[PDB]
Amino acid sequence: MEQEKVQELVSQMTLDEKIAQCLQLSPFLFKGTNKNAELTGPLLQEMKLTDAHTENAGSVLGSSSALDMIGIQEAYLKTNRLGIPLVFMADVIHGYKTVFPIPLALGCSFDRETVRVMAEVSALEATADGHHVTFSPMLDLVRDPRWGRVMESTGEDPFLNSELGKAMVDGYQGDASKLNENLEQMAACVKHFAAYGAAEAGLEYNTVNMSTRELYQNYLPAYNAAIQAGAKLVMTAFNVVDGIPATMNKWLNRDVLRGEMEFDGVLISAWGAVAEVINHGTARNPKEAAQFSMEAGVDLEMMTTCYIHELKGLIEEGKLSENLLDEAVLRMLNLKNDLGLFEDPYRGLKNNDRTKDILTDESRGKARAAGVESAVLLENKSRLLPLAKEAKIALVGPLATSPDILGGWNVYGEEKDGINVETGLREVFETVEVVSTEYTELSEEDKVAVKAAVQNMDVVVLALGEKNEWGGEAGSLATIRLPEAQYQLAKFVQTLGKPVVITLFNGRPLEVKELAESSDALLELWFPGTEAGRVTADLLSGASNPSGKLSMSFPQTTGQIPVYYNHLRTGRPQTPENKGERYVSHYLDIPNEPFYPFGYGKSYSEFELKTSSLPKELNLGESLHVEVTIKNISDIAGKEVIQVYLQDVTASISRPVKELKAFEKVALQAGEEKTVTFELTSEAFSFYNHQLEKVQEPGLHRVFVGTSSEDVDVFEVEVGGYVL
Amino acid sequence: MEQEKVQELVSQMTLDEKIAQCLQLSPFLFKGTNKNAELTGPLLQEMKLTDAHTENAGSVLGSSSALDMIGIQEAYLKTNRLGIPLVFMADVIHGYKTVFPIPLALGCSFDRETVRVMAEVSALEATADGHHVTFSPMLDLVRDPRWGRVMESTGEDPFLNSELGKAMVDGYQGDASKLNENLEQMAACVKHFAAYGAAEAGLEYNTVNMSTRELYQNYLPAYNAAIQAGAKLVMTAFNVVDGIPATMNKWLNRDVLRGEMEFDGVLISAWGAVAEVINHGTARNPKEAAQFSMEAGVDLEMMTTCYIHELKGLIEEGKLSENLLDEAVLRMLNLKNDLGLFEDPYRGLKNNDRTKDILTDESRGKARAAGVESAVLLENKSRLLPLAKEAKIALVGPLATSPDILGGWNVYGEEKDGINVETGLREVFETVEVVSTEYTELSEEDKVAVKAAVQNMDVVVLALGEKNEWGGEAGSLATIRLPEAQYQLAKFVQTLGKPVVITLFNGRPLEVKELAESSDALLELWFPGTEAGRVTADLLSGASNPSGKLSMSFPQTTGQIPVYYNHLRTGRPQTPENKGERYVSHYLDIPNEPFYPFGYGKSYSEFELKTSSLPKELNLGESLHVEVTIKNISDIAGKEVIQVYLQDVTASISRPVKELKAFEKVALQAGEEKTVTFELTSEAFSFYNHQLEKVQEPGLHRVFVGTSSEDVDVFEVEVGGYVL
Numbered sequence A, B: 001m002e003q004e005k006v007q008e009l010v011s012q013m014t015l016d017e018k019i020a021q022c023l024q025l026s027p028f029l030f031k032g033t034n035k036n037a038e039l040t041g042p043l044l045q046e047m048k049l050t051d052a053h054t055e056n057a058g059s060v061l062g063s064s065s066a067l068d069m070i071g072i073q074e075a076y077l078k079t080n081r082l083g084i085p086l087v088f089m090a091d092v093i094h095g096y097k098t099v100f101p102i103p104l105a106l107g108c109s110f111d112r113e114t115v116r117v118m119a120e121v122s123a124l125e126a127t128a129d130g131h132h133v134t135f136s137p138m139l140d141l142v143r144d145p146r147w148g149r150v151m152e153s154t155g156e157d158p159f160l161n162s163e164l165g166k167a168m169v170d171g172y173q174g175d176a177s178k179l180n181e182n183l184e185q186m187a188a189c190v191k192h193f194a195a196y197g198a199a200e201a202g203l204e205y206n207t208v209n210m211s212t213r214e215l216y217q218n219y220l221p222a223y224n225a226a227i228q229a230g231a232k233l234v235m236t237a238f239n240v241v242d243g244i245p246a247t248m249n250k251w252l253n254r255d256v257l258r259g260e261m262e263f264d265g266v267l268i269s270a271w272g273a274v275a276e277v278i279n280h281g282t283a284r285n286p287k288e289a290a291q292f293s294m295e296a297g298v299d300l301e302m303m304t305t306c307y308i309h310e311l312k313g314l315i316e317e318g319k320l321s322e323n324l325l326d327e328a329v330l331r332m333l334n335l336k337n338d339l340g341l342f343e344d345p346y347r348g349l350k351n352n353d354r355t356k357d358i359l360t361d362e363s364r365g366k367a368r369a370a371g372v373e374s375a376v377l378l379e380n381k382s383r384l385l386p387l388a389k390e391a392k393i394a395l396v397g398p399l400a401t402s403p404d405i406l407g408g409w410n411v412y413g414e415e416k417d418g419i420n421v422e423t424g425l426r427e428v429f430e431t432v433e434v435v436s437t438e439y440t441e442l443s444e445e446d447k448v449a450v451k452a453a454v455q456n457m458d459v460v461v462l463a464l465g466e467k468n469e470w471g472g473e474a475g476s477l478a479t480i481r482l483p484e485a486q487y488q489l490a491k492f493v494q495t496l497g498k499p500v501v502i503t504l505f506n507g508r509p510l511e512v513k514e515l516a517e518s519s520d521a522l523l524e525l526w527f528p529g530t531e532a533g534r535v536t537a538d539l540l541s542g543a544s545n546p547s548g549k550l551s552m553s554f555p556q557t558t559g560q561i562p563v564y565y566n567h568l569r570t571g572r573p574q575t576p577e578n579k580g581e582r583y584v585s586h587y588l589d590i591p592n593e594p595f596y597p598f599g600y601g602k603s604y605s606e607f608e609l610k611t612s613s614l615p616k617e618l619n620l621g622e623s624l625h626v627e628v629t630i631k632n633i634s635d636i637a638g639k640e641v642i643q644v645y646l647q648d649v650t651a652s653i654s655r656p657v658k659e660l661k662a663f664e665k666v667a668l669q670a671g672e673e674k675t676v677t678f679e680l681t682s683e684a685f686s687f688y689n690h691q692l693e694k695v696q697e698p699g700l701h702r703v704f705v706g707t708s709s710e711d712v713d714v715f716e717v718e719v720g721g722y723v724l
């Protein structure tokens, strides 16, 4: 409808109506739900909610199906005075019913189109079940694999994170200004604003602290890119940002998000984060929490009651302007209008059962493709892999048969539709002997049984991994290791004298040195989603050629953390030339380098890269154009990820030794050659100075072109002169 | 001499003379050195130093003896044009020849007077060997025991650090205005300005980052307190502060140190730190390094040649004002004048050989007392300790006979003067059987010898620890554990059936769970210094009663780091009454609490405390007066450390759950009772806000009185009303 009609609605609502429009509730707090109605009575009572509240609530969180939605919306519109339909929101993080790889695995793809397609398929299905908004992309930079929520990030690089964030937004939303017509796309909600990934000691919800400059330099750019690409909502973070919980942090959310980033959509709280500012010790009570969170421009309180119980008295007493409440309501109604909910509150479902669009074969194929793009081949000694279809396989370990391959933050997908490792292998390989073992134990009887199966077969597929419940939210591990039993199983299998491939499933970097040394090949599958066993079987047999690169550094040991490729030099760097001197930046007991670096991943193919003549000089404001010719010089078709890094040699702030500024994943048949070109704009050369100005300084930059952060040729470009 | 004549000298100096005044060199770069003379010509050549440079150099670093100093100063003064004597500086960190406990252990003393005495003795001896300045106190706050330099800090609390920092300055300097007269005291140099102990991942020289607010709130207060107490010099830090190496950080050194903190003494670079800004990437070359470091107010370049080769041209070209140089020179000359060098350049040594004053019996008794104050009794199950003097002792492990008990940063003390554990124990106990093992091995042959000795005796003194070389500078350990052979040894010894005391020697918190669980008692001796074997024997026999408390938390495991007592609450705190629940701040694999907390330590005595009646309300600006009555209710004389904490329940920044604001260590005879009183000024109630104002807000505080950060009674005071 026309904007005048939306503004009119605001004018006509009562104060009590405007307040309740700022509340989101679980579906079973509403009449007309068709699941968990036994939770409704006691929980309404604990939260002290009445019909006056629920019949005017702004939003529903986590509907269970199209029918839940339809029934809830229908009963709500019988009783709502002005006819304002509910907006339905959900967590569609890496797939709805067709589950794609976890975001961190999608980071390792380095493939923007894989990510867009995952987001498109997710929206297709999620809209078919009545959801209007997804709480994705998660854009928290991560340098600390202790934190369970690394699985939801695309990793340690702001540039990569930004680029894949934009891809996800584009895939979920399509053309943002036509969400009232394109009812198979949905609104995206960027989360968690801001810097939640920097949780101290990797502990869930724990203190975050960095300088404002570092916040701008590394922690904000990805949210920003997703905002500028049209993300409709933003969600606040749990953590403090320079001492103030992000939810009530006025500077953060008004000055930065709404001012600098020019965000003018719904700011929704993370779950309970409005009330939790009390726990943080920056509000005395719910009256202060409500006031501070509304001052900071939070429009929508997720499942707590500070707003509904306290805004009236605040406004009546004049501690809080009613204009701020009106601004919040207007953003909520604009969101609804942007989804076409005032013409069609059932968003395409009312006379159109779209069951047919859910978990199709086309969709499963895309997830399989996603899975094969995201896996990272870490070791392959002796060209053990690809295995031949007639190789006789002993498939052993906790991930041989486990149905737990869909990943954390799989709110809607079902393990029964998933393909386990065994089932995946038996479609491809004629001889497989299996010995399942438990995640945390290694018994004598297991060893006997493993030994018998290995004696029978020619190669071992050792499937190790985490349960998903060991990560995700509030799955923090102080020591980033598999259970010791799995390391002991890898040690045992090694003694059996047969070649070993380890297929590792997990949601975080782990200490894998012991696994690499106990096997001939090591394939990092992360959690691939619905098609996990086929992803695995196609990569092992070579029907697919691994092409993933690490988007997060794998530490030598827990105590190396944080370790990341874009690090400062320090005043006493170790060099190949001073190696072994005492008075340099090193550890006595491990290497400075991570076990595996950002951008690292093997292939069954071999590539050669050639960079065309770069200029020796560039003007300020001028783009650098990088042309690179890649050739597949092997007999095996495959894909390589070309990466370009920039370094600022001398600057008014100590700058990272490299930063990624471009990447493209290039597909090449055996003997095929391509030229790809990159533009590094002058923004790729700029950074935040100690005055928090985004600046370009004249001087020397090095440019690194290659296939990891370590495998690069280096070039020098001197920036100076005039500007543009 | 009169201030007018100090000025006169500056006018009288040539540009080349003023430049060289800002250079510090090792003793063997000067003519007249009585040691390492063979190094002179080559290093001179490598640094491109001439006679004109060395003959006008400002300062000597690390003189080897009184005769080095005398010889150097005597030759220097025969050729110096204007008669400006050299100032001699040294690393006297926890003792000169009489070595006291490492500073972290002195931290565990909670004893201001012990700290002042260490410093007074240190100056007594150092001045006797011709040193004018010590590079102490080190006041870097530490939360990361991976960093080897934690041994030099007094720990994780800024208040303790502030308080003991003041004590060391007083002990070294006495009355600062009379350093020209009191030739047995010396100048203190506060180090390292600033925030060096926050090195990322505990890696030496590594990136530091935190918000400016946190810099002010936690990282600056102890340097400030030492400066206000009259510290004569300050030394720069190796690390970046917010992206800019401290040594050239104008904001840090002019605005904060010289401006806010009103420091008007010599600012000396850490070793090479001027040249190292090039390595950091914030200067292109030694001309830029010199210019920026002089801009930042660094007066004295330690053993690099940026100033000496670059200032002239910088001043000639007009890129730098000669006034900044004149100011650096005046500060150097004023420090010499404060030390009396213009009347007596030999600072009391010339016709008075003070060999008599070094390593006296009186001094050794003070170092032993310091060791007994500083040790921390962590476990004592079932009154194993004190041992009766007729107890038959199996003394086993790497620290049984090791002479490595003086600690890191022992530049001048000699192991030959130290007392090892066996020698100590044999002065007190009649029967000791000794089996020495290696630091990093546990052989079958050791196990047989250990077993034979334990079967012979009644009790096991298991002496474990670190070589000092595994810490101190550039002694960074990714995993904070002893060698695994020592943990194995503690497991083996436990199986032998006999009570075990573990006496642990080290320079950092370690993972000690496995030691506590494998023994009956556990005594943390750190590195006590010269009298270590007697410190240990007296604590074990009960001739001295353990009284130290932990000044740094001992983590459950490496991956818990940083863990510290003054932590934020977060938005989802684990409570007693939600424990077990998933969605709270916790780890899946360890407790939140450190294995041992700040302020914790046992005693052979038992004490009772009761806090006199506190007010319910206080005005802003008003002090809180806290009266505590302590009774020793055992038959054993000893000391308790009374500790007072404050918490700010609600603030405009999320405030720590506790902060230490007072402490006093009370000596009590069996049955003795004493009353102590504390004043917490309105400043204890104040913090830095998000605009970086030092502020006091009305509201609730809790006051905790007790004998650890955990063993406390709690009281509430509501601050409001008007201001005093």
Ligand SMILES: OC[C@H]1O[C@@H](O[C@@H]2[C@@H](O)[C@@H](O)O[C@H](CO)[C@H]2O)[C@H](O)[C@@H](O)[C@@H]1O
Binding pocket: A091, A135, A191, A270, A271, A272, A473, B583
């Ligand atoms: O789910 C929406 C939003 O909130 C958080 O999930 C919450 C979790 O914090 C806790 O409240 O448990 C409830 C159980 O339903 C979850 O909904 C997530 O941190 C956030 O990412 C998510 O988008």
Ligand SMILES: OC[C@H]1O[C@@H](O[C@@H]2[C@@H](O)[C@@H](O)O[C@H](CO)[C@H]2O)[C@H](O)[C@@H](O)[C@@H]1O
Binding pocket: A583, B091, B135, B191, B270, B271, B272, B473
């Ligand atoms: O001792 C002077 C001063 O500088 C540093 O010590 C240096 C060390 O950095 C390295 O360069 O090696 C030389 C060996 O002589 C040391 O002097 C210390 O970090 C600092 O604390 C000390 O006060």
Ligand SMILES: [Mg+2]
Binding pocket: A648, A649, A650, A651, A697, A698, A699, A700
């Ligand atoms: Mg530059």
Ligand SMILES: [Mg+2]
Binding pocket: B648, B649, B650, B651, B697, B698, B699, B700
């Ligand atoms: Mg307060």
